[PDB]
Amino acid sequence: MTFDDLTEGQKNAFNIVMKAIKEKKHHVTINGPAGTGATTLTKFIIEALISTGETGIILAAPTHAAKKILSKLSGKEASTIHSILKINPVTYEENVLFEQKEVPDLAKCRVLICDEVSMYDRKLFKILLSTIPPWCTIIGIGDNKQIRPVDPGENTAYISPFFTHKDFYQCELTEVKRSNAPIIDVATDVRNGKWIYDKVVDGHGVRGFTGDTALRDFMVNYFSIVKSLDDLFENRVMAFTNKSVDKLNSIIRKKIFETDKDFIVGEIIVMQEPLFKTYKIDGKPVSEIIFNNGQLVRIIEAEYTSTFVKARGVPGEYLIRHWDLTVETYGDDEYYREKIKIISSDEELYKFNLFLGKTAETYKNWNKGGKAPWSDFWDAKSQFSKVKALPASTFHKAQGMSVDRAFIYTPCIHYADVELAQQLLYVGVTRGRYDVFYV
DNA sequence: TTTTTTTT
């Protein structure tokens, strides 16, 4: 923006950066915490880097929604590191895994910028390190105090290697201009180990609910602020577990739209996984991305019907009652109108997984002659998608999403060990621009 | 007990 006029932390981070690029082998990760103004720095690292005449820049982001908002902030285009490292899903019998098909050329990139580096697990990181050549220098940026990478397969503290591995020289971003920042304060105390508390200035700030009536108060304060508003777009209620998140959208939806219904026309919902459209040509399929994971979409035609799923190589048909839901892109992204099959019954889903495992068993060992008709496995499985209602999300899924008012639900947070639960509250708190509430 | 990403 000012070119160089910035915080000492920024001014320095920049100077370190350029010399890591200007000399050979070395790397960098900047730790912006919240309030330290990490984004504007990142913006400046880019604009400046292009005007020095550097051709070799690429912007890599850990996720799709992350890549969207990265590409939007710089104005230059950016893809996922998976796209770059060329990490391609490879199908095995009943499973799927993401491994690196082949190492990309990467002679046209002398500077590799990563965003949200606090999401990198090790399996991904190693591929990364083994890929980038010496003529390239990785500059990561993220928050060591954000929610640590999810790696259920391995037990250990385990923050992203950007903040550990020897090859990276990491500098910290210094605190910014002191203004009235009730939320930034609390969040900076949470980063430092205090639990959430109340600080209110001017009438806006972090406010909790305690005593015998806690949830009733907290909820009655929600439905007053949200009311029948079908715009929750700026009000996000968060929780650790999905069990709680699910309980919430239930209660919340039932009051705002007065119904008992799983889906309602004109409601906005969020894709939990990508939606793929696949055409077969000359027998060999191709697929385009209709909806990225995290895309919000609007319900237009919503009807509850059944389906008879089958698989060649399995006896009979099975009746799976699901929703036929036609849905369009809601947002600043590409507009598609489509229809997905979506199962809500725990009763019905179970019935399906039953089938899903039977055909698996029979293809896993098949001598009928031939090899195995796996095409009828996934074609049949991909028939159904995953979604969640807009109002509430898990702390994990809310990273990077900034809303006017954030509503935080503590009770299930204790299922997380201290280190993480602090990362959760940190993430949770920093989501609200204006107000933050917690029970 | 609990959280979850990713491709032409």
3D architecture notes:
This protein has 439 residues and is α/β, with parallel strands linked by helices. The protein has helices at 8-22, 38-51, 64-74, 81-85, 122-131, 182-191, 215-225, 242-256, 346-364, 375-381, 418-431, and strands at 27-31, 57-61, 78-80, 87-91, 96-100, 111-114, 137-142, 168-172, 199-201, 204-208, 235-239, 268-271, 275-281, 284-291, 296-309, 318-329, 337-342, 387-389, 392-394, 403-409, 432-438. Strand 13 (275-281) and strand 14 (284-291) form a beta hairpin. It is globular, with a radius of gyration of 24 Å. 33% of the residues are buried. The structure holds one DNA strand of 8 nucleotides. It is classed as hydrolase/dna. The entry lists the keywords RecA-like domain, SH3 domain, pin-tower interface, coupling ATP hydrolysis to DNA unwinding, ssDNA, HYDROLASE-DNA complex. It forms a dimeric assembly.
Largest sheet data: 6 strands, parallel
Strand order of the largest sheet: 3-2-6-7-1-8
In terms of structural class, how would the helical and strand content be classed? Answer: alpha/beta
Give the count of structural domains: 3
Number of strands: 21
Which CATH first-tier class of the largest domain would you pick?
Alpha Beta
C-alpha end-to-end distance? 40 Å
Strand content: 25-35%
The helix content is 25-40%
**How many helix segments?**
11
Indicate the overall shape. globular
Radius of gyration: 24 Å
CATH topology of the largest domain: Rossmann fold
Under the CATH scheme, which architecture of the largest domain would be assigned? Answer: 3-Layer(aba) Sandwich
The CATH homologous superfamily of the largest domain: P-loop containing nucleotide triphosphate hydrolases
Keywords: ATP-binding, DNA replication, Helicase, Hydrolase, Isomerase, Nucleotide-binding
InterPro entries: AAA+_ATPase, P-loop_NTPase, PIF1_helicase, SH3_14
Protein name: ATP-dependent DNA helicase dda
Pfam families: AAA_30, SH3_14
